[PDB]
Amino acid sequence: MIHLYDAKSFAKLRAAQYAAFHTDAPGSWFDHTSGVLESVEDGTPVLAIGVESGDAIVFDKNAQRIVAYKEKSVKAEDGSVSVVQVENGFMKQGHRGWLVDLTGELVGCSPVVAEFGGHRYASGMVIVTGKGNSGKTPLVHALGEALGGKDKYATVRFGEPLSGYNTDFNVFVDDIARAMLQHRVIVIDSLKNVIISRGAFDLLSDIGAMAASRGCVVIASLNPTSNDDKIVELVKEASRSNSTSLVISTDVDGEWQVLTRTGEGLQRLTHTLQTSYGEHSVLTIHTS
Amino acid sequence: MIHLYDAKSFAKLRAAQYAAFHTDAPGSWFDHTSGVLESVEDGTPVLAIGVESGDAIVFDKNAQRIVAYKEKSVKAEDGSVSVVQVENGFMKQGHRGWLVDLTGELVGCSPVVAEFGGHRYASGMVIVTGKGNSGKTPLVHALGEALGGKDKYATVRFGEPLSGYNTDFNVFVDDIARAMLQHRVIVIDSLKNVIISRGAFDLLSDIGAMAASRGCVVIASLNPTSNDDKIVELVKEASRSNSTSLVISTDVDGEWQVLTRTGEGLQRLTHTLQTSYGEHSVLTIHTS
Amino acid sequence: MIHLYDAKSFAKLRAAQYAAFHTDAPGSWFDHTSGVLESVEDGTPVLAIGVESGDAIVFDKNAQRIVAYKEKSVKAEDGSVSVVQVENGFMKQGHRGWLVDLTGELVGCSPVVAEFGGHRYASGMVIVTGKGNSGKTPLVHALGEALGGKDKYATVRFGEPLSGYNTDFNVFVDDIARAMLQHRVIVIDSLKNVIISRGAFDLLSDIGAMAASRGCVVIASLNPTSNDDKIVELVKEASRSNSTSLVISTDVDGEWQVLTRTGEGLQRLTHTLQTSYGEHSVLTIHTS
Amino acid sequence: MIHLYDAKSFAKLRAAQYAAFHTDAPGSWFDHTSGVLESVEDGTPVLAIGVESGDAIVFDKNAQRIVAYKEKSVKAEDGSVSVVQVENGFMKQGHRGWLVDLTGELVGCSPVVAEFGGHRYASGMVIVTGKGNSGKTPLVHALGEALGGKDKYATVRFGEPLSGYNTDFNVFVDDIARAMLQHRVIVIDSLKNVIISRGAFDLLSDIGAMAASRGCVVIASLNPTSNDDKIVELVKEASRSNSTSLVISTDVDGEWQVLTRTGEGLQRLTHTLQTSYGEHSVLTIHTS
Amino acid sequence: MIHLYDAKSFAKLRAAQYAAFHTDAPGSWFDHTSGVLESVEDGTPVLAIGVESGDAIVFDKNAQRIVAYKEKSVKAEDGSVSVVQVENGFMKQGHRGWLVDLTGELVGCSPVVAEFGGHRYASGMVIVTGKGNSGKTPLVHALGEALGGKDKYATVRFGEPLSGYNTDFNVFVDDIARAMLQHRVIVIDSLKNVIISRGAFDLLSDIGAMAASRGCVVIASLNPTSNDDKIVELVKEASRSNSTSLVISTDVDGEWQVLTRTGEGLQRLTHTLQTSYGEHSVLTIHTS
Amino acid sequence: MIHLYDAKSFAKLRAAQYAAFHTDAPGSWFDHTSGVLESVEDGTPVLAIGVESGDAIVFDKNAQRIVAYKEKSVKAEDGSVSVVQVENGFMKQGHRGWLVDLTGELVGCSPVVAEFGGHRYASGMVIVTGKGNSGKTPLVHALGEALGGKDKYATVRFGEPLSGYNTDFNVFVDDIARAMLQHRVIVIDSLKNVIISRGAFDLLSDIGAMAASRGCVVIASLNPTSNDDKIVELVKEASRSNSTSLVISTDVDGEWQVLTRTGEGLQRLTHTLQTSYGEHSVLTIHTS
Numbered sequence A, B, C, D, E, F: 001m002i003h004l005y006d007a008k009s010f011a012k013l014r015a016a017q018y019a020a021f022h023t024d025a026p027g028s029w030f031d032h033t034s035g036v037l038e039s040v041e042d043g044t045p046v047l048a049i050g051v052e053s054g055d056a057i058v059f060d061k062n063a064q065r066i067v068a069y070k071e072k073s074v075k076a077e078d079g080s081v082s083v084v085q086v087e088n089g090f091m092k093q094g095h096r097g098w099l100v101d102l103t104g105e106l107v108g109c110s111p112v113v114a115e116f117g118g119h120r121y122a123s124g125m126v127i128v129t130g131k132g133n134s135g136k137t138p139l140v141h142a143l144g145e146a147l148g149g150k151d152k153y154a155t156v157r158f159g160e161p162l163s164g165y166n167t168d169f170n171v172f173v174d175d176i177a178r179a180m181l182q183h184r185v186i187v188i189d190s191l192k193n194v195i196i197s198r199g200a201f202d203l204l205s206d207i208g209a210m211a212a213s214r215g216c217v218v219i220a221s222l223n224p225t226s227n228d229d230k231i232v233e234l235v236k237e238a239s240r241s242n243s244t245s246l247v248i249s250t251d252v253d254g255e256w257q258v259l260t261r262t263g264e265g266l267q268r269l270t271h272t273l274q275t276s277y278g279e280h281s282v283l284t285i286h287t288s
């Protein structure tokens, strides 16, 4: 919805957004939204995401698809009305994204998802890309484990000529929806086949906001299938714009750079990562 | 509708348009149209805006969507007939934009929306853009607060990978319509995802005229997602053409330039803005 | 329809076309077609123009839209048959343009619309363009007043972010049709948003012939929204091809050049215009 | 249909095609096909041409459109079957082009349409183009009169901002069909708006074959609306390929070059034309 | 269908393919498939080819179109099932190409179609192209006569502005189907208008395989309507890829080069052709 | 589905994937999936692949198409539900790819398909391409025989102007599905006509994952029909991205380079191949 501000309430908003990244306990936002989600009546639509065609499928708090749901509305504070309706397994009325309010008045944040190696990491969409064919897959997995911390991270596999990899976009969105509804740390191996269909376009444009709102982080691998020309600069450009955080390779072996958006209108931070390979290509991110 | 002129009536028109920006009390036009809007019979369609598909949704003076409205016509002075009809929540007959006359014979104006730092600001569409990834978000908010003056400004959030940000174009237009119907100062954070669908195309082409007619100002952030090449010059070009006022960054830190169209065929003014950051990235525009 | 010629009848045609611009009394052709139009039976379709979709709306001699009209045909001299039918406010059968014969055997003319400053001006489409962001709006208005002479000129406003400006293409064509049916001198402020939909494409391709046939002049502003590169040369190119007359800016302040097509296969004339601004940007074209 | 050959019958074919241009009496082929056309049963479809949409309208020997015609077939020598059916004023079954056999075994000819200034001219499509904005209109008319000889030439006007010029593609094809069905020499002023819709595409691809088969000549003006760059070379290229004869301007004032295809696999001739203007831009082609 | 191989059966396949071009009696394969075709039950679909829309028409062994044919299936050795069904003159079920097995286990061949001047020529698609506007038409005809030998060659005419030339793609495919079903040597004058609709695209992709399977040769003229730049190199590139044999012009007058694909994975041969013109442009290919 | 990991389970996954290529007995994975496939209830859908339109056809374990199959669902461990339904020979519900689980928890592998010349080869998609018109066909066949070892390899022929070559995309996918369901080593001669329709696009994006999951290898020929410019670099680029293994030609005659992806995030190996031709172009790959 829309929000109103004057100098005073605006300053409070900024302090709150600043705290959402810098001082809140890492992962607390995710814990909070998990709470909001479980307090939702069973069968109640909570998430809508677009499939390849352009239509959208809807899920309940347990990541189960909703096939039929009689039109229901809700009058928000802003005065705006929200309407959701599912007919034949497709949203008849509604919008894409979260169908229940997880944020409230606190919007424009990059909720800290975790802390590692002396650095806080934001939730939302994290794109790992750069000078093609490098080691993006090992990096997203190391990041997944690291930010997972005490928890296991979820792995969504898509569009690669390797065994067990799903190649159907609709199964893919089904996997992403379930992951964001149930896990704080998510890895997507290859956006390669997403970059274009309407469903695919709806994905780059929604994933980050959905994740940031939930308080979960989605770490996506994106190899510039294109040349190794300066098209990678175009990819890096597009990525920086649709990501909460960007991670790109450097000229130095095993070194990556992390560019983070700490929040709406807030300062963008940058820090470096040093890595090394172990047995069977397991990558380790050096801390202290 | 169409208007006729001879040397004399044309001169009066120009003087009136000139006064609408230079001498009228800042924000008086907005107060006037608020008056015209509240004098409209309840349920009467007053605003039509296009959604993604190309169809248009219609709103009444209270920013509530109209689902069904039996065909009704009106014979204007010009002799032209206006017809509006809403069927199944969509305009069956009518045109996009204001469905009730707010302007009358006084057209081609850039109604002064506010005065700040010794400069008058026009209503309509104000695009803030330039040398990418600068500080456009902090600037649109500082401008919003400044032009809001005694009033709070409204904030429409769209297409950014940050918490609580809507990413559905149809919710976005619903937010814009409500904002223009109820507030004099509006901020839109990111046209990034609007630049293309038919609904999106209808937006760049209508927003400015709708706002200028209402007497409200829409301050939109537009980061050249493109390279940092001279594509930003193309963006600045496109922006200057579809905006009532343009605000672009300079080579000098914190300095922005404001280019204003004071009215139909009238002189275009330019003035500079000096800014500085405070705590939590709150930006302040220096006055005296 | 088609016409046949031999050396003799061809020479008579050329003399007649030559006279239509060089010797006829300025504006006489418009007076003549007004006569043909009012002698048409009420309700009889006289003009068809395309709307955005590609379909066409039809008007009667009083500029009122025709919603339903039972199929009717007419056998021309050429042996060709004309058929018109309107169903549900749209042409079921017919063609775009004038539905009644205004020209007869006298075709290929640029009927003199007016005389001013020692120069005759042709009817049809007049495009004012050139080195972007100059002063095209003040110029089309000064031209409108000047060619209007003793009469008021009509002003069609479209696609600009200023108050009261219509942005719906269908309202726009409705405005153009009414203007050509009722006034000799017409001004269109901004073709900016017309340059593309089928209706818009049908416009550039028809307007000039419709105007020239009626004997009215349509003066359209066209700012090269594009860069200030040599794309303006492309715009000037396209304009010269779809216009009866072209008016472009020069390197000299206030100076414009007028390029006129005096008729089918006839010589193209060129003359210069000197201008200056008065109060409130009212532009004056210097005569003697 | 298809034809079979061996060295002997092939040689006879070539001699016959050679004679069709070099030795037959100018215009005899047209006289012959007029004979075949009038011997056709009334109401019988003889010509199908595509309209803008892609569908095709059908005409009888008197150039009257056929609205309904019950399916009828014909078994050709080749063993191939021809079927024609018109439903609701549109070809339900059939192909574009002549629906009755005008050529027979004699195909691949460029039937001499006329003789003038010591040169024979071929029937079919003649495109007049070259270094833009020159004097193409005066030239097509002079050519029309000259090749018309004792007869009047027909003039089809289309897509120009001059009085009485039709701008509807469907009226245009109706004009072309009637012209080819009733006249040996045809002039089309401006293919400008044809170069693209399916109907328009069907036109460039059919006109020449239709004309050549009838034995009539279609002289079409084509100004390279494009720049004056070497895009005119592209236009000249495209034109040479879809024309039976090409006429282009030279660096010498009033001088044009005529490139003629004398027939299938036959030698292509070239000759020059000298011209001068008289009163009211009437152009004269110098003979002796 | 699919075929299985081990070193031994693969070697036999290659020897057989090698013999199909190098040692079989010229034209024997065509005689063999004629035999397979006439042994087919009357009315049985044998060939499917795509029309402009994308749909396909079906023919029986006598080149007569099939309008209705009740679904029928066949279980192949490979275990794959073949299904054919024609409803309303269009393939309801089936695939494009030959609907009856002409090849069997012997696939990947370029069956020798004829022998001339000390060189064997392959069946399939032969594209004659190169440095535009040369003498491609005379060459395809001389080749047709030469490879026809004791038999007459068939000539399919399409897309040229000459008398009797069909310009409807659907008549064209009807002509090609009939030709391949009844003649060993076929000439297609101009693929010019085929290079794009779905039917046209299906043609370049099928013609060669259809011809090679039948054992007939299709000699197609293809003039690079494009510039005379190095776009002809692009055309020559595309042609070499979709042809069984390529014939291109050289810098030497009357000299052409023949590049032949002798079979799947087999050596590509090249030989030169010397030609000269006789009376009425009849071209002769020099042998001894 | 999605999988969860922590440092420990991730390390086990990598060791398992590493073993799937480096230590498992060559071809064991294929033997295993054959086992899973035959244990499937008859009539049960096991494979879905897209046809040209975009729809998908479904096959049972015996490579027979399924025309009708009543909706049935399955609840996976991940909590995700799988649904399959076939109506009128087309998937009403389901996704493309394997419809039965062949991999389980072991995903991201490049199962060793065979061993030859001292090198292990991965299953999945192997693209053979490079400096056009070289000897790709002989190479894919030699590779097929070599990796087939004791077994025969299957050959799918498509899109070449040679006898018996299918040119219908739907027959092609039918051939690929059958091949992967019944053979460990598959050869596809020419992807030339696949590079674009939706079905074709679904192919490049699925084939590798389908093959890798089955444990079979698909060796596809891909000649850069494009120029011999550096577009082949683009083709090689695209190929490396959608292939499990890439095989490209070098500047050295008969020498090819093999680039293999050994698994998810694992090291990419490279080795060279030396070849020579024997009789009838049978190519031999040199071992010791």
Ligand SMILES: Nc1ncnc2c1ncn2[C@@H]1O[C@H](COP(=O)(O)OP(=O)(O)O)[C@@H](O)[C@H]1O
Binding pocket: A261, A264, A265, A266, A267, A268, B132, B133, B134, B135, B136, B137, B138, B221, B223, B277, B278, B280, B281
């Ligand atoms: N205190 C500060 N000092 C300097 N720059 C700042 C400060 N706070 C914020 N910024 C800048 O403001 C911008 C952040 O807002 P954001 O909306 O993401 O940027 P933009 O819209 O201009 O691309 C960044 O470019 C950031 O570097």
Ligand SMILES: Nc1ncnc2c1ncn2[C@@H]1O[C@H](COP(=O)(O)OP(=O)(O)O)[C@@H](O)[C@H]1O
Binding pocket: B261, B263, B264, B265, B266, B267, B268, C132, C133, C134, C135, C136, C137, C138, C221, C223, C277, C278, C280, C281
């Ligand atoms: N008094 C004046 N002196 C100089 N220039 C003026 C004056 N008044 C108006 N202008 C110019 O006229 C133009 C304003 O009308 P506008 O329609 O926006 O321009 P345009 O259509 O040419 O892009 C501007 O370019 C402005 O700078």
Ligand SMILES: Nc1ncnc2c1ncn2[C@@H]1O[C@H](COP(=O)(O)OP(=O)(O)O)[C@@H](O)[C@H]1O
Binding pocket: C261, C264, C265, C266, C267, C268, D132, D133, D134, D135, D136, D137, D138, D221, D223, D277, D278, D280, D281
């Ligand atoms: N008397 C003349 N002397 C020189 N040029 C002339 C004369 N009369 C006409 N022209 C030329 O003939 C052309 C006018 O016919 P038009 O159809 O508009 O041109 P085109 O079709 O070649 O672009 C113009 O280029 C004009 O300058």
Ligand SMILES: Nc1ncnc2c1ncn2[C@@H]1O[C@H](COP(=O)(O)OP(=O)(O)O)[C@@H](O)[C@H]1O
Binding pocket: D261, D264, D265, D266, D267, D268, E132, E133, E134, E135, E136, E137, E138, E221, E223, E277, E278, E280, E281
């Ligand atoms: N007797 C001849 N001497 C030299 N050239 C000839 C002769 N006869 C015909 N030609 C050439 O043959 C070609 C004519 O056939 P055409 O089909 O139009 O050409 P193409 O298909 O190669 O563009 C022309 O290029 C023409 O100049």
Ligand SMILES: Nc1ncnc2c1ncn2[C@@H]1O[C@H](COP(=O)(O)OP(=O)(O)O)[C@@H](O)[C@H]1O
Binding pocket: E261, E263, E264, E265, E266, E267, E268, F132, F133, F134, F135, F136, F137, F138, F221, F223, F277, F278, F280, F281
């Ligand atoms: N004995 C041989 N010696 C040298 N080259 C050969 C031999 N046999 C076949 N070739 C080459 O193998 C290729 C033929 O198979 P083809 O499928 O048409 O080629 P490709 O798929 O690589 O374009 C040709 O490039 C041909 O020149």
Ligand SMILES: Nc1ncnc2c1ncn2[C@@H]1O[C@H](COP(=O)(O)OP(=O)(O)O)[C@@H](O)[C@H]1O
Binding pocket: A132, A133, A134, A135, A136, A137, A138, A221, A223, A277, A278, A280, A281, F261, F264, F265, F266, F267, F268
């Ligand atoms: N032990 C290792 N040492 C060096 N590089 C390795 C090692 N293990 C894996 N890699 C690199 O990791 C990458 C493999 O994972 P992959 O997903 O295919 O790559 P990417 O996603 O970056 O294109 C390869 O670029 C490979 O060369």
Ligand SMILES: [Mn+2]
Binding pocket: A136, A137, A189, A190, A221, A223
């Ligand atoms: Mn990867």
Ligand SMILES: [Mn+2]
Binding pocket: B136, B137, B189, B190, B221, B223
């Ligand atoms: Mn921003």
Ligand SMILES: [Mn+2]
Binding pocket: C136, C137, C189, C190, C221, C223
């Ligand atoms: Mn203007």
Ligand SMILES: [Mn+2]
Binding pocket: D136, D137, D189, D190, D221, D223
């Ligand atoms: Mn002209």
Ligand SMILES: [Mn+2]
Binding pocket: E136, E137, E189, E190, E221, E223
């Ligand atoms: Mn030719």
Ligand SMILES: [Mn+2]
Binding pocket: F136, F137, F189, F190, F221, F223
């Ligand atoms: Mn090959």
